[PDB]
Amino acid sequence: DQLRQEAEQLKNQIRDARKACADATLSQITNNIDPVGRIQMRTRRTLRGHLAKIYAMHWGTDSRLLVSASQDGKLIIWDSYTTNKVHAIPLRSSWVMTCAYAPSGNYVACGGLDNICSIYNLKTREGNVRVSRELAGHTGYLSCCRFLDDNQIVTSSGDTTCALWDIETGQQTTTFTGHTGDVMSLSLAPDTRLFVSGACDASAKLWDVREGMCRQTFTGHESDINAICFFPNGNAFATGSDDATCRLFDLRADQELMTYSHDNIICGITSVSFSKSGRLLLAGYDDFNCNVWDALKADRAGVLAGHDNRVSCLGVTDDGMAVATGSWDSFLKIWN
Amino acid sequence: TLSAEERAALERSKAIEKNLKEDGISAAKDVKLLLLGADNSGKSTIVKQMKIITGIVETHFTFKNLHFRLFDVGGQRSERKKWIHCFEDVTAIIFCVDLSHESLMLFDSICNNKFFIDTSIILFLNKKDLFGEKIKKSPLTICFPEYTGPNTYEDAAAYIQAQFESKNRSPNKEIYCHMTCATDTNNAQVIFDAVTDIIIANNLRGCGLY
């Protein structure tokens, strides 16, 4: 009983300090910048070959090779320049929700509803792609696999927890807990020592991979958070929920900086990504199109459109040369 | 394509495309169905020709040169709003109800879901003998206090069927009903008729006749 009141006064103190630190909104301080105008992107490539809905996609570190999983049980690796299928990996379970591409390009992990994170080896001496490891230990559907290195991978599940694995041993090295709902998405910081996870309890909290501690937590969303992406310099992140709103939280200030809501937007955000500079906040909605938000004034600086069904995944290359979108109509489109 | 290695890469890509097309052609013969219902309702014991293969459970029995894949979503124990859209393309929903309120709640939730507004439902009422033996011992009034009709088996079963169909509340959807016992073998035939009827209706809608 006393612990409940202690928690209540702790939350009150945290909120009071958080409001005390706030002096001016981002939209007020940066009001003097020239607008970026209208950013028109044209479809340069259209990657076809998938025969079912696409849930995930990841870009190679070299910004030329892709990876995508769909309901057909196929894991296809594309050549984003000449539109060629380098590999075609058949999954054991057709229910897959999260691709991941290794930073070194050697491995590609691909897990989903079947509760395990299958890890595939691309550079084999036999010339084929083999499942190097199959990581088990989660009691719920998997989401947003991310590679730290060639032998370290972070996973998120519907078990209201995130886990850090060791591919060599295959055991759950560290487990992060504290969420009260299904954890839907995570993104790894460029410094590669912290990561943030967006759960179904309308809250995203920052984690530490080394200590396994919840350093920070962020609130403000009215519904389940569906995607998260870090700011390029590793000091902010943008979240997307079914509330049809995007928000920009800052790790140093511990508060949301601005909101990216438009009156004409009804459906929520499925995927969130930034640009290389950190000025365009691209977000995918359920109304079949993506809106490019100028991340400093919250004005729609163009619309991608072009897709027939819901956009399920976004991807911005490391050099920023392209933006690739995947949707449920089994078509990937590359924009520039 | 000018180089030799790029020509070989293009040939490899074309071979992969051909393999993908063949696999997709071979992946259209099957029929994808969804199993649902309360626990201990016989949702895993419909057809004796089971041939299965924590997570998702697949059953791939075949009939009349047609492959039926039953995805039993049981055991997930998570929020259905986040993965139920993975089954948007299922031909039908097989709902199993044991007659011997929660089942009505699931049925209401699954029938009015935004993903399955046009997906027909095949409703199975299991354990006729158990229900008929239990109704004599206890009248159908403890769970349905609004009942007024006769306590006979036929009228009670029809009343339960009526309350299960009353939650439809949607056009472009049909509920196919069937009464099953433990010692029944023709469930495959009933599923085949329901699936072919659903396919006929979908083709009718696509052709523009209706």
């Epitope: 030329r64 090779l65 050549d79 060629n84 380098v86 590999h87 390009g105 001496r125 036999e126 010339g127 084929n128 | 000018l2 180089s3 030799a4 290695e5 790029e6 020509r7 070989a8 890469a9 040939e11 490899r12 071979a15």
Partner: single-chain antibody, 233 residues
Framework: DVQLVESGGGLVQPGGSRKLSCSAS????????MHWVRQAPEKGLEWVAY????????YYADTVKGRFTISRDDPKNTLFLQMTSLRSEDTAMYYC??????????????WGQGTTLTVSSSDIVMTQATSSVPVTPGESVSISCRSS???????????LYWFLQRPGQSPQLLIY???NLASGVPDRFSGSGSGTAFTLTISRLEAEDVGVYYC?????????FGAGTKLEL
């Protein structure tokens, strides 16, 4: 273990027909384009034939065009080579080489053990400046070979391959485009080049590194090898 072993060699009379079988075991045979490379006695390597994956595209050398026949048996994991008429110039040690082509692959990594065949009695020209170089261990060595055309394609990839043949063994790939190190070779190797002049350097040479170094172009068929530079100790 990847292993290519071939049989069918021996002494044959001129005008006869002989078939060589290259049996593969240890990799996905159906996904690898396979070549045939012959090495005349103390003369050097020379390309012969190539069959793509699935027997789609097949090429032949101008010397034996219309005279040899190459066939692929994917279920049996066997590669054949049928020759109709044999002259006295066909006597050589025939090698079987696998080649997989995609973005970032190593298309000459593994070579067969070699089979010896004896017979009783426009193109891109690659030239190697020196035929024999004596050197002591621990001293860096520079090997260079030129090409007639500029192998630097429009896509930025230069198709130059450097092979190493230890005495009594089969050639092994070291660098496949300009500096892309092969799988398992020591990191002391390094390669460079610009358009038509290319150089291979070996820092801290070891005693197991002596042999004959071949540079081959893959820009356009027929593939042509260099004269061959031999390291002496």
């Amino acid at each position: 273990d990847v292993q290519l072993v071939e049989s069918g060699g021996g002494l044959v009379q001129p005008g006869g027909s002989r078939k060589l079988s290259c049996s593969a075991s240890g990799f996905a045979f159906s996904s690898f384009g396979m070549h045939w490379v012959r090495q005349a006695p103390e003369k050097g390597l020379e390309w012969v034939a190539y069959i793509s994956s699935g027997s789609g595209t097949i090429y032949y050398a101008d010397t034996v065009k219309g005279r040899f026949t190459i066939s692929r048996d994917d279920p049996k994991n066997t590669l054949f080579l049928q020759m109709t008429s044999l002259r006295s110039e066909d006597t050589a040690m025939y090698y079987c080489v696998r080649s997989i082509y995609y973005y970032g692959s190593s298309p000459f990594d593994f070579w067969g053990q070699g089979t010896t065949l004896t017979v009783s009695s426009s193109d891109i020209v690659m030239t190697q400046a020196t035929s024999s170089v004596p050197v002591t261990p621990g001293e860096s060595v520079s090997i260079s070979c030129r090409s007639s055309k500029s192998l630097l394609h429009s896509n930025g990839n230069t198709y130059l391959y450097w092979f190493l043949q230890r005495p009594g063994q089969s050639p092994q790939l070291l660098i496949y485009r300009m500096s892309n190190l092969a799988s398992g070779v020591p990191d002391r190797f390094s390669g460079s080049g610009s358009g038509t002049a290319f150089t291979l350097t070996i820092s801290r040479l070891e005693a197991e590194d002596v042999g004959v170094y071949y540079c081959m172009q893959h820009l356009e068929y027929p593939l042509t090898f260099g004269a061959g530079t031999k390291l002496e100790l």
